[PDB]
Design a protein around this ligand. Structure first.
Ligand SMILES: [Cl-]
Length: 549
């Protein structure tokens, strides 16, 4: 009941709950750091729907999805009665009229102008903060690109989202070909007339049970921690604090931000697009081979990838926080998903946890990341040993959910310090990019978040959603997606590596602002990692050729 009681009726048709934990930290970063962490995901579509059909169905599709996913209509920036800005709560307004519903549809289901490509949309959206501040989700239909395939492009705040956006997208794609929606559009003069037929005023009593809750309240409710549980979480907090001070290798940022960034995605508003997502994609067949080859070594694709990132940063940058006479270690900065401790029902329809990230920490000792024989030039055996070390340290850091016992306190501390720092920087007239970088470490530690394939249905027909191969022989209206694109947003002076899979396609990418890092160096590290993955896999498969099947 802690989950229900937390959303309180605060006005006639408005629910409100406090933000708690990582979600509160994220909300403050999005406000004070120009949309830091915000997510853009494109689902690239093959479809025999005309652009015209998709355009006339999109708004009603989004409205239909909102009916069972009211999470799409939440809001996280408001005020109190005393004027003051409020970053500490999430609110939900239950829509009571057709006009209000139509307003929300037209603000949230965007038809992109003829010509703009999916890649251009991902670049544009990942290079700015969502507006108005507080808005949590927007869907863009790119139905008439001048080249490339059409796509559903979603832009979301990270405060209440993550993995969940793929399911939100899947629901929208299902609605676009739903037989009942198609009949509605066919029988109505307009979207507004259709809406007028099927509109039901939203009921805060029923919808409260479907709105997202903090991981922290789901944790309290499911695990009911006692004092020993709290003690175990406090120990994992001490670990993260100490690891953040130990000598570490990493990628050095510019001492001062670049005023003429030389790597951009073009220019919009007259200003360069400097938030970059450098990507390496691995196809379905090669992905399977990599996955099996590293299992044959007793390793895993995510941990071996981390080892290669750590080693390639070491070799390419030769940058550390320690002295020259002292080999550094590696501070591991990574995220973990709470599904490792919570059942799948935690992430479904009843009070779902829609942002389930817990910060992870670990420290590779100097003797574990360098070889006595080869120094930084680790051979394949040594990289597998480093992978196993990294994996073991993550497994011990994450062995228990009681980490969550301190994320509310850490979230409060980071949020308060961010607001106080931002107010001080404003009063001092600090340049905005200097302000986003001066508090960042001169050396960015190796930062990799790894995501297993999320099983999202790939085929949508009037009979529903299914898992199937790309249509060779369409029998009805259908939508199929065979590839995704991620645009992460990192506005502070850090480099974030992301490893993820969608539709069997493996993507390794780095996102960062080129005002703060040499993009050529990051590009070289990504190339090094892919080369090491392929060479180590080929050697593993040479010893065990069965791993090719
Ligand atoms: Cl998540």
């Amino acid at each position: 009941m802690l989950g229900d009681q937390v959303w309180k009726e605060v006005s006639s048709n408005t629910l409100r709950r406090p933000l708690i934990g990582v979600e509160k930290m994220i909300n403050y970063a999005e406000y004070y750091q120009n949309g830091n962490f915000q997510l853009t995901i494109a689902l690239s579509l093959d479809t025999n729907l005309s652009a015209d059909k998709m355009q006339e169905r999109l708004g009603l599709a989004l409205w239909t999805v909102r009916g069972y996913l009211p999470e799409l209509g939440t809001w996280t920036v408001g005020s109190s009665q005393d004027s003051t800005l409020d970053l500490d709560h999430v609110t939900f307004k239950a829509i009571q009229t057709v006009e209000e519903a139509q307003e929300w549809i037209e603000d949230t289901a965007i038809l992109v102008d003829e010509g703009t490509t999916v890649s251009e949309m991902v670049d544009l959206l990942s290079n700015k903060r969502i507006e108005p501040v507080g808005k949590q989700f927007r869907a863009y239909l790119v139905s008439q690109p001048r080249h490339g395939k059409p796509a559903l492009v979603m832009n979301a705040s990270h405060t209440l989202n993550g993995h969940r956006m793929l399911f939100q997208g899947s629901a929208i794609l299902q609605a676009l070909v739903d037989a009942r929606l198609t009949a509605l559009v066919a029988s109505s003069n307009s979207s507004r007339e259709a809406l007028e037929a099927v509109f039901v005023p939203e009921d805060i009593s029923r919808l409260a049970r479907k709105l997202p809750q903090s991981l922290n309240t789901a944790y309290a409710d499911k695990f009911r921690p006692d004092e020993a549980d709290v003690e175990a979480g406090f120990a994992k907090l001490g670990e993260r604090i100490l690891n953040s001070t130990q000598p570490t290798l990493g990628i050095p940022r510019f001492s001062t931000p670049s005023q003429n960034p030389q790597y951009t995605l073009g220019s919009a508003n007259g200003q360069p697009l400097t938030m970059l997502n450098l990507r390496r994609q691995i196809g379905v067949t090669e992905h399977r081979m990599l996955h099996r080859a590293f299992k044959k070594r007793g390793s895993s694709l995510p941990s071996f990838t981390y080892a290669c990132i750590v080693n390639s940063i070491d070799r390419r940058c030769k940058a550390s926080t320690s002295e020259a006479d002292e080999a550094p270690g590696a501070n591991l900065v990574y995220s973990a998903h709470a599904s490792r401790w919570f059942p799948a029902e935690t992430f479904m329809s009843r009070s779902p946890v829609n942002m389930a990230i817990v910060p992870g920490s670990g420290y590779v000792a100097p003797e574990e990341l360098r070889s006595k024989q080869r120094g930084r030039d680790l051979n394949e055996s040594e990289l597998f040993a480093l992978a196993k070390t990294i994996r073991a340290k993550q497994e011990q850091y994450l062995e228990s959910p009681h980490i969550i016992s301190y994320t509310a306190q850490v979230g409060d501390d980071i949020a308060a310090a961010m607001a106080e720092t931002a107010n001080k920087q404003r009063q001092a007239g600090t340049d905005p990019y200097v302000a986003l970088s001066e508090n960042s470490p001169a050396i960015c530690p190796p930062t990799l978040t790894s995501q297993g394939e999320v099983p999202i249905k790939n085929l949508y027909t009037p009979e529903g959603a299914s898992f199937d191969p790309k249509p060779k022989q369409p029998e009805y209206e259908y939508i199929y997606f065979g590839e995704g694109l991620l645009g992460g947003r990192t506005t502070d002076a850090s480099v974030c590596f992301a490893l993820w899979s969608l539709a069997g396609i493996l993507t390794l990418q780095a996102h960062f602002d080129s005002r703060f890092f040499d993009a050529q160096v990051i590009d070289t590290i990504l190339d090094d990692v892919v080369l090491q993955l392929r060479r180590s896999a080929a050697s593993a498969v040479d010893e065990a050729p069965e791993a090719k099947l």
